[PDB]
């Protein structure tokens, strides 16, 4: 089953159950100058959940484009290192605005995974907040799932809050078990962080409200916000362990491999490049341009990290913008604004890669020389600062190179150099 | 080697190296109204490290009484469940106020452990911050420790900051390996939290200054603060795996066993009672009295949790204050104020146990009845609030009973009940 078929089936399943299918919001948040990029389906509905905005539907469903490259939800460093993390991904979500609550949300998700998608329950694993007896009863006594594939988890993973004040409540999560050929343990075990038991669907129950003085009260109309990664469930439905092996990435990875002259289609730097073109092209299409401040600098950082991975692969000629075309062919039916903006996106990414290529090769020679002469395992702060200040290397780009060689960078020493520079500038 | 001999050998070792041996400060912090209790040897010297207070010595050593039962980390819930956690413990520390730095600090610690204490290097394990090449070079190239018993760890465990602003810097830690008979893995492994590799000594290097804007600059006079748990090194030096098996706790546990009429010195509630008399008696000796606010409520909570464990053991008469006498006999030479205050401490703890005994028996009947009839795994919030509001059960005491029966408590439901109560007023 293709990713496009899963996306369409998800939305139709919830439309049949009375959910208004709404378009994805932009990656640039409209009403939040404190959020870098839209990072969940919830973002555009935040004022509805708060009761600050009224809409003519009380349940909705979206496939929301998200980027997690900043804040605590920063998966940029996991890209290329796990089977399950992207910068750009689509979050399939259903929302209840004071309408249904835990019973329907749990039944909707279980019906979709086990009935519409036909996933064997023996491959699924469920977690609840360990103080949420309602969710546990619904799962164990109503749905009647296997209680040996069930974990009760504390507030760090399974209790959610919109902020210090505002709505909060427990969460329940559904995981897919990729089997004994993948390292890792089930949720709650010391090895839960492995790629074997992958979190597929997170259901948030807005149950309580905390006021400015800290009082907790019950929400007058409890609400639901859920989120499932399209790529992870597509991997499940296409029989592969890594998100990068699904249909949606095949043309991207093949094109990058051709541009690098390689047959190693599983190469981690090709996967990084395929991930980064998605976030970079969609970010530009949503109006972000490279810069040295704010949202433009996150875009600049990801673009330049993609260029460096091409350098690592031996690519000698401008290449990154050539992946906009297979991306738009693959995803343009779902995201026509990408097709409409394709030429402008290519021009922005070409220009940025050319700007960085002015200094990349010379900066890489310095780095390679540093590693060759290095006594310890830490690239020194003055070298990091030199690459940043003279060669346009973001610190995290240098650190990404370093980690490929089992090295770290001296972040504190770099910050000391920055402070010394501010005094001189 | 007895705990008192280790304490004295530690202080003398550093006195021989020019350290002013200074007395422990009180458990009640004087110059930090946001800290509940003194939780490290650093606390009384914070203003010296900050340069706000001048002293006639630039290097020092203390055996500091600490309580960690609130705030960050908070080890109250670990007491009785691990070989290594207390509420009250003594932290052996050496301090450099802009004097020596990483090299001396590392050699001082390795000399004390491997030469003064004679601990085999093969039983020790060292961690450094993974960006601290100075610490790594000193250990590996100067001291020349076994590089296979060495871990590079990230900023969460091996980078320290005094606050959002102020001094910060890398840490290096020394662990003792209790061997194959104890579960757990080395620092940095998924199973690092086990009791096999126990952290003995933490060395903090104040190397940088972070300002209100987030900028780092080098500290004008780098400084050192170290801390080593007396009980953990005493277990090592006495050939036992658990803190509760050292000389000080052999006496306390045996006395508790006599009060409970049992020969089963391995009963976990005896270890809890033995730990809690230390925190409760020293807190009272330092002038804290039970109350329903602030520091007095933490004392009240620990006292009442100790009483609840006596109830679990079947103790039928007022008992907790009777452990003050063996505590004073065991620790009174090092802490004469405990001897001076012994009768006052006894009276305070007796009165609190008597005040609580008015309702403990009835509340326990409710709790036992609730457990017998309970559907699910969560004690409901209204029962939690009843036990709190009418029977004087702190929420964490009820939760401590609950986990003994594989149960949790509904904290959010309790807070809802508290808000409902405020509304009725
Ligand atoms: N970086 C990512 N790459 C790919 N898929 C992701 C990524 N982040 C989240 N997802 C998918 O989106 C779903 C919803 O994300 P969300 O962050 O709300 O849940 P969560 O990961 O449990 O939250 P938290 O980690 O903060 O507890 C996840 O269950 C996962 O399937
Ligand atoms: N609750 C406790 N019970 C017994 N010993 C303790 C306790 N907390 C700390 N110690 C001992 O005191 C030493 C110094 O503790 P300190 O808090 O400075 O370091 P830490 O515990 O590594 O800090 P972190 O909170 O970052 O883990 C520890 O290495 C340990 O030997």
Residue numbers in the entry:
A (entry chain B), B (entry chain A): 1 to 425
Authors' description from the paper:
The N-terminal fragment of AlaRS corresponding to residues 1–429 was used for successful crystallization. Their structures are referred to as AlaRS429 for the wild type and AlaRS429L219M for the L219M mutant. According to the superposed structures of AlaRS429 and AlaRS429L219M, the side chains of Leu219 and Met219 are situated in a hole formed by Pro167, Met206, Glu209, Pro220, Ala221, Pro222, and Ser223 (in motif 3). The only structural difference in the hole between AlaRS429 and AlaRS429L219M is the rotamer change of Glu209, which is since methionine has a linear side chain, but leucine has a branched side chain. However, there is no difference in the position of Val204 observed in the crystal structures of both AlaRS429 and AlaRS429L219M. Leu219 in AlaRS429 and Met219 in AlaRS429L219M contact with the C-terminal segment (residues 206–209) of the β7 strand harboring Val204, and thus the amino acid identity at position 219 could affect the dynamic motion of Val204. Interestingly, the B-values of Cα atoms of Val204 in AlaRS429 and AlaRS429L219M are 19.96 and 26.68 Å2, respectively, suggesting that Val204 is more flexible in AlaRS429L219M than in AlaRS429. That is, the more dynamic Val204 of AlaRS429L219M invades the space intended for the extra hydroxyl group of Ser, whereas the relatively static Val204 in AlaRS429 allows the binding of Ser without inducing clash with the hydroxyl group. Unlike the previous study determining the structures of the post-activation states, our structural studies about both AlaRS429 and AlaRS429L219M in complex with Ala and ATP depicted, for the first time, a visualization of the spatial arrangement of both substrates prior to the activation reaction.
Aminoacyl-tRNA synthetases (AARSs) play a crucial role in the translation of genetic information by attaching specific amino acids to their corresponding transfer RNA (tRNA) molecules. Alanyl-tRNA synthetase (AlaRS) often misactivates Gly or Ser instead of its cognate amino acid, Ala. To get structural explanation why the L219M mutation prevents AlaRS from misactivating Ser to produce seryl-adenylate, we determined the crystal structures of both the wild-type and L219M mutant AlaRS proteins in complex with ATP and Ala. AlaRS429 and AlaRS429L219M consist of the N-terminal nine-stranded β-sheet structure harboring the catalytic site (residues 1–241) and the C-terminal α-helix bundle (residues 242–429) responsible for tRNA recognition.
